[PDB]
């Protein structure tokens with residue numbers, strides 16, 4: 001063990017490494033934190049996520065004023081592209097909605113990377129079989 005499950009919420013602020021000089025962790029009104037001040041080409045890595053025996057869907061709780069994408073990659077921002085979440089505008093960086101995307105079947109313990117194409121605030125993400 002010593003391993004977050006893919007099937008419970010992974011807090012987006014709980015990255016192990018990241019690229020993006022302007023990236024902030026900040027607190028949410030209802031409790032907890034989220035990541036934000038994201039720009040194109042920023043990424044975060046979440047070490048040792050246990051995808052167990054298969055996940056084929058990702059859900060992210062996100063907020064943004066303009067449609068944007070989050071790529072879900074293996075290992076590094078240059079790794080295998082498992083899928084892309086096409087994030088709709090929610091009207092506000094404070095209005096959060098759960099958004100889902102399919103991914104290639106992913107199993108076992110993996111390092112997961114989210115790669116951003118523009119501004120978005122992210123509370124958590126989770127996978128489903």
Ligand SMILES: O[C@@H]1[C@@H](O)[C@H](O[C@@H]2CO[C@@H](O[C@@H]3CO[C@@H](O)[C@H](O)[C@H]3O)[C@H](O)[C@H]2O)OC[C@H]1O
Nearest residue numbers: 026027035036037038039092093094119120121
């Ligand atoms: O309540 C706070 C949120 O509103 C805050 O959202 C940030 C708002 O600023 C965003 O940056 C703008 C994106 O578009 C660019 O063209 C502008 O130059 C930027 O300033 C940023 O992406 C959001 O995260 O987040 C923190 C909350 O406390």
Ligand SMILES: [Ca+2]
Nearest residue numbers: 011033034123
């Ligand atoms: Ca969070």
